């Protein structure tokens, strides 16, 4: 840790990091460069209550645990020179750094086949995006969503609640192929279908003409608005240009170090080790942005601190479904706790590998999720019959281990 500290990006990873630097006792300069002209804010509300209530003053991040930080909002870092230890800003200024931290997140992938579209086609990442989409959620209008990932499905649920007709096109045979157990994905499809979402599996968009979207089965979907949610791409351009190791994401170790001395990276922009799979992955979650930012800050201030070690997890709020998912989507065994039913949905899935818990899912069962994450963290090997048995208390099991 060399002063001054400069962070590029003012999202959750950046805020979490700078707050932890302060809390851990670093008293040198901190400057944060954020391209959005917005008081730092959290993204999960954008496809949830914000999309429904529209009050941005409910979604701001708490920067009060980060005193004495200059936030340069509405400014873009254009490049950095890792020899000179400087960053070039879009407003013509240059910042010196001792330690540079790249927390620039990721951007929605565009759909090449809609590039020349003459109808509204949006993606959903920013507050500006959310406002633009919400303005078009007219009751009885038709929305097409491209992509059956969590954000697309959260938008689908939000739009149906708003009285919007929703169609959704997914290239895979299932929803949430990226990070969800098949049992969960099958149920989620049944839920959205029951709520009036017109789901099209194993279809892709081939183009569009005069307000109608074309599919690869040679058919058509008329829509008033298209929202594309086919994944994201790391915002790693400054890193690539500066000669850091990148591949749709900046490679970092558990200390957040890039291949360039004195340059670190955090959050959605990073490709990092998933301790459960033992492979490098881009981990695109709120918990990662916060926890990785905190861990990297802590170890910079106190080199005796361990590197980042948290196991992955996320949640999704889709209408009546409060979904929580931790760890790996599959192993060699799944245990189902509760009935999987559209009538008052409430269940837990547990994924095992050779008897060891490697993942878990809770649907409308938050009480079970914390204990399961603890069992997951220690690689617990509980009695499978006990894990299945409804009479088993999971909190006690986690306390006993």
Ligand X SMILES: Nc1ncnc2c1ncn2[C@@H]1O[C@H](COP(=O)(O)OP(=O)(O)O)[C@@H](O)[C@H]1O
Ligand Y SMILES: Cc1cc2nc3c(=O)[nH]c(=O)nc-3n(C[C@H](O)[C@H](O)[C@H](O)COP(=O)(O)OP(=O)(O)OC[C@H]3O[C@@H](n4cnc5c(N)ncnc54)[C@H](O)[C@@H]3O)c2cc1C
Enumerate binding residues for ligand X (CB under 6 A). Answer: 111, 146-152, 169-172, 176-178, 204-205, 229-232
Binding span for ligand Y by CB under 6 A among 162-170, 195-203, 215-223, 286-294: 286-294
Strand 220-222: give its sheet, edge to edge. 205-209, 212-215, 220-222
Establish if 114 lies at the interface with ligand Y (CB under 6 A): no
Establish if 354 lies at the interface with a second copy (CB under 8 A): no
Binding span for ligand Y by CB under 6 A among 32-40, 176-184, 248-256, 349-357: 32-40
Establish if 81 lies at the interface with a second copy (CB under 8 A): no
Establish if 147 lies at the interface with ligand Y (CB under 6 A): no
Helix or strand run (H / E) with residue 388: helix 384-388
CA–CA distance from 3 to each of 15, 27, 31, 44, 45 (Å)? 18, 9, 11, 32, 34
Establish if 47 lies at the interface with ligand Y (CB under 6 A): yes
Residue 178 binds which of ligand Y, ligand X, a second copy, none (CB < 5-8 A, kind-dependent): ligand X
Residue 289 binds which of ligand X, a second copy, ligand Y, none (CB < 5-8 A, kind-dependent): ligand Y
User: In the 8-state DSSP scheme, what is residue 260?
Assistant: S
The vertex-335 CA angle with 329 and 341, nearest 5°, equals 90
Q: How far apart are CA 157 and CA 64, in angstroms?
A: 34
Establish if 103 lies at the interface with ligand Y (CB under 6 A): yes
How far is residue 125 CA from its own chain's centroid? 10
Establish if 359 lies at the interface with ligand Y (CB under 6 A): no
Write down how long the chain is.
Answer: 401
Which of 279, 277, 278, 311 has its CA nearest to residue 292? 311
Q: How far apart are CA 289 and CA 98, in angstroms?
A: 23
Q: Among 259, 330, 364, 392, indicate the residue that binds a second copy (CB under 8 A).
A: 259
> How would you classify residue 237: left for phi > 0, otherwise alpha for psi between -120 and 50, otherwise beta?
alpha
Q: How far apart are CA 53 and CA 70, in angstroms?
A: 31
Size of the site for ligand Y (CB under 6 A): 36
Q: How far is the CB of 48 from ligand Y (least distance, A)?
A: 7
- 183 φ, ψ to 5°? -60, -45
Residue 345 binds which of ligand Y, ligand X, a second copy, none (CB < 5-8 A, kind-dependent): none
Establish if 35 lies at the interface with ligand Y (CB under 6 A): yes
User: Which residue has the CB atom at the shortest distance from ligand X?
Assistant: 149
Reading the block at residue 98, the tokens are 């001792």
Establish if 279 lies at the interface with a second copy (CB under 8 A): yes
Establish if 245 lies at the interface with a second copy (CB under 8 A): yes
Establish if 77 lies at the interface with ligand Y (CB under 6 A): yes
Establish if 152 lies at the interface with ligand Y (CB under 6 A): no
Establish if 273 lies at the interface with a second copy (CB under 8 A): yes
**Largest distance between two CA atoms of the chain:** 65
Beta-bridge partner residues of 214? 207, 220
Please answer whether residues 99 and 110 qualify as being in contact, where contact means their C-beta atoms are separated by less than 8 angstroms: no
Question: Would you call the peptide bond into 4 cis, given omega within 30 degrees of 0 as the criterion?
Answer: yes
Q: How far is the CB of 54 from a second copy (least distance, A)?
A: 40
Establish if 46 lies at the interface with ligand Y (CB under 6 A): yes
Please answer whether residues 123 and 229 qualify as being in contact, where contact means their C-beta atoms are separated by less than 8 angstroms: yes
What track of x and - describes contact with ligand Y for positions 318 through 357 (by CB under 6 A)? ----------------------------------------
Q: Which residues make up the interface to ligand Y (CB under 6 A)?
A: 8-14, 33-36, 43-44, 46-47, 76-77, 103-106, 124-125, 151, 235, 238, 267-268, 284-287, 289, 314-316
Q: Which residues make up the interface to a second copy (CB under 8 A)?
A: 243-245, 247, 251-255, 257-261, 272-273, 278-280, 307
């Amino acid at each position: 840790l060399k002063a001054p500290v400069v962070v590029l990006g003012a999202g959750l990873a950046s805020v979490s990091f700078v707050a932890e630097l302060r809390q851990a006792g670093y008293q040198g300069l901190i400057t944060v460069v954020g391209d959005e002209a917005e008081r730092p804010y959290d993204r999960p509300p954008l496809s949830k209550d914000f999309m429904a209530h529209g009050d941005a003053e409910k979604i701001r991040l708490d920067c009060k645990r980060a005193p004495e930080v200059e936030w340069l909002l509405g400014v873009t870092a254009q490049s950095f020179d890792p020899q000179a230890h400087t960053v070039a800003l879009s407003d013509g200024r240059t910042l010196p750094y001792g330690t540079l931290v790249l927390a620039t997140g990721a951007a929605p992938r565009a759909l090449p086949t809609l590039q020349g579209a003459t109808m509204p086609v949006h993606t959903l990442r920013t507050l500006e995006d959310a406002r633009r989409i919400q303005a078009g959620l007219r009751p009885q209008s038709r929305l097409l969503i491209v992509g059956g990932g969590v954000i697309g499905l959260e938008l689908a649920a939000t739009a149906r609640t708003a009285g919007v007709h929703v169609s959704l096109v997914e290239t895979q045979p299932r929803l949430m192929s990226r990070a969800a157990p098949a049992t969960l994905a099958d149920f989620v499809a049944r839920y959205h279908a029951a709520q009036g979402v017109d789901l099209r599996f194993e279809r892709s968009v081939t183009g569009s003409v005069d307000g109608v979207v074309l599919l690869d089965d040679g058919t058509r979907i008329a829509a008033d608005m298209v929202v594309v949610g086919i994944g994201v791409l790391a915002n790693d351009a400054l890193a690539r240009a500066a000669g850091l190791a990148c591949d749709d994401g900046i490679f970092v170790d558990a200390y957040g170090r890039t291949t360039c001395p004195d340059v670190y990276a955090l959050g959605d922009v990073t490709r990092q080790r998933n301790p459960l799979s033992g492979r490098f992955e881009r981990i695109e979650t709120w918990s990662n942005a916060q926890n990785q930012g905190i861990a990297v800050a802590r170890h910079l201030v106190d080199p005796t601190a361990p590197g980042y070690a948290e196991l992955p997890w996320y949640w999704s709020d889709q209408g009546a479904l409060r979904i929580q998912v931790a760890g790996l989507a599959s192993g060699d065994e799944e245990i189902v706790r509760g009935e999987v039913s559209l009538d008052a949905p409430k269940f837990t899935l547990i994924e095992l590998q050779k008897g060891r818990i490697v993942g878990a899912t809770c649907v409308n069962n938050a009480r079970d999720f914390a204990p399961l994450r603890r069992l997951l963290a220690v690689g617990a090997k509980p009695d499978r019959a006990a894990l299945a048995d409804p009479a088993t208390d999971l909190r006690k099991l986690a306390a006993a281990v």
